[PDB]
Subunit: 273 residues, 3 copies
């Protein structure tokens, strides 16, 4: 129940659209950052190693109870910081750099998801056959604060982060989850752990060709909805969603705010017999 | 049991604002399209007859479980296509054309609502005196993909679709439901089946002069809220909302995102003794 | 109980950003307006005295059942009007000027919150140690209808309104709740009564360093969520949110739509031993 987690902050080139490279600010060389998974009640001992020689970075986990001005503080270039705090609430939480201006650090790529598994799981656990994590984020004009604050996103994208060995692990880009769809089998109930990290947009989350059997808002098992076509996610908003795929084919996964879908936010689930 | 539905795709001029005609892409000569009502558990046998001589069109019902790559496929100009799928979930679901670019087809007018009536209705059925269906959509600069992707809506609008003969059946425009308000009587509980089809905006749905006694998110009877002033609808989001009108007068119906209201999204409800 | 409330409509200079003065349209010389607090079941006898010499004004309370065309009607310059209506529903409700164009009156500053206390309070009343009221609003280019309808907000801001002597009572501005943080003590469970009055944006409401233990949507005790990281508020949407601060320090309060936080929407909560 004491968990020890280490990440680096670094600058990494990410191909966010075909032929379009963004010099992203990242945790562990991915944007969004690596998945973190803990159990409800765990105490996290988190170390951030700042490998950006130019600017400070920090870590804010939405899962934890912490003092932001003591526990989410900036770690200087080529220094490390270690912070300890509990994850007392089950669900699907955003994490991100909390260095001012926070919009600048998030928009440049410093966001991710931490999942906190509920003590007694979900009441539909037994029904689920397969699970994946999906994250939505936006990309803007490169490190352009005016665009971050006042412009529309250049791209809106999905990525998937591995829950277990063999799961895809991808970055937020307009194509990878079209070219290499997530995989499932006919008749399966799929669970997706989803978070919209923004920075700026809300998400109207919809899987084409199915209906969500069960939805747990922010992944807290108490927040139970049934039979939703589309799940409204605020910026930083999470959910656990579950649905059945009844026939073979490819099922798009979108935000239904179609300007964002048009700008990259469509992932594919390939369902085979 | 088995329901057979035939609709056409065609181009239809729609006066979306006073003296402003939009050459809309439509189902059945209306934008949004005609209301479709079925019962929970029905199998739908849907035929789309494409009467557009230039562009393919298709049909995605949010109500159904289907293989999108087999059952939501394009129907070529001057052809028909028939697809069969179940509607196993109660609620107020969006439908729309699913032809790429989907944003273009939705924005041009190819959207609508299908209601799936719950097996046992709603726990508040006995309390309801009167019902209407309202849909919110946006209009952009005519068939302008840059405007669709990056621009603000030119108009945001409500329409009503007839559940009963002599309910109003209108298109998405800025003026019809102001000039010809919906009708009700003092003391009645009113139910609205509502959906925000977008394409791009979320909706903050509010009836002036009342509070929603009961709300069922996406029209599923299990998703029950009470005493809401305003209902957040994602793009494609639906609800069943119920409220009492206590006094004679005219009650505006709005999205409380007032930029949208100002750009046309105000309908009126005239309540008389 | 019969409650008698009076406010004046007037023009008031407000420093919405450091060194930036907005000639606001206001209730009682504040924007947002003064807090109103009543009990569920109260009959409100409200008088508006319009001291604007040129423009009519009005009052629409989301809390009440009323005829908008009789009870929310315009009051002419230098005149008064008195209107009587019940507040039958518990929660945190927006109020605002209902004079056309409503977008202009809201955007210029004529918005506020009325709290309706539930007849039997909230099931978590016993756990709550301290309470505050926070309101989110936007500001645009001064009285510029094109910007109101089509532009991004220039500032997005929080204000606090007083429940008791010593509670901050502030205007919507970019700085006051940063310079003068809300106060709390380590270990306290804090209740916030919150409303996003818009006019145009939704809000992704989040307290940094904590998780909401309980959330009551629109402040109705029945609309109960648990363990939310972030609360989605439509334009005009309210909530009662409760959270624990476990450690000393300063905790930012944000909308997590970070373009808006960047443009002013960050308040501070300073937690001491
Ligand atoms: Cu950073
Ligand atoms: Cu955050
Ligand atoms: Cu089409
Ligand atoms: Cu759809
Ligand atoms: Cu006014
Ligand atoms: Cu209002």
């Amino acid at each position: 129940h004491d968990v020890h987690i280490e990440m680096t902050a670094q600058i990494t080139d990410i191909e966010i659209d075909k032929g379009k490279i963004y010099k992203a600010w990242t945790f562990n060389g991915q944007a969004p950052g690596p998945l973190v998974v803990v159990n409800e009640g765990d105490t996290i001992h988190f170390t951030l190693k700042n490998m950006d020689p130019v600017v400070p970075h920090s870590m804010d986990f939405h899962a934890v109870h912490a003092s932001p001005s003591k526990d989410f503080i900036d770690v200087m270039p080529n220094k490390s910081g270690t912070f300890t705090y509990p994850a007392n609430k089950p669900g699907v939480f955003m994490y991100h750099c909390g260095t001012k201006p926070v919009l600048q650090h998030i928009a440049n790529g410093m966001h991710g998801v931490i999942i906190v598994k509920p003590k007694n799981g979900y009441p539909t656990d037994k029904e689920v056959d397969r699970e994946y994590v999906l994250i939505q984020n936006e990309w803007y004009k490169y490190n352009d604060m005016n665009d971050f604050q006042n412009g529309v996103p250049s791209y809106v994208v999905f990525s998937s982060k591995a829950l277990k060995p063999g799961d895809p692990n991808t970055n937020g880009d307009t194509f990878t989850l079209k070219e290499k769809p997530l995989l499932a089998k006919v008749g399966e109930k799929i669970r997706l752990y989803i978070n919209n990290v923004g920075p700026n947009e809300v998400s109207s989350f919809h899987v084409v060709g199915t209906v969500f059997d069960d939805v747990y808002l922010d992944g807290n098992p108490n927040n139970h909805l049934q039979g939703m076509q589309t799940v409204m996610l605020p910026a930083s908003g999470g959910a656990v969603v579950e649905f059945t795929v009844t026939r073979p084919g490819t099922y798009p996964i979108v935000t239904h705010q179609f300007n964002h879908a048009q700008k990259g936010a469509v992932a594919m689930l390939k369902v085979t017999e």
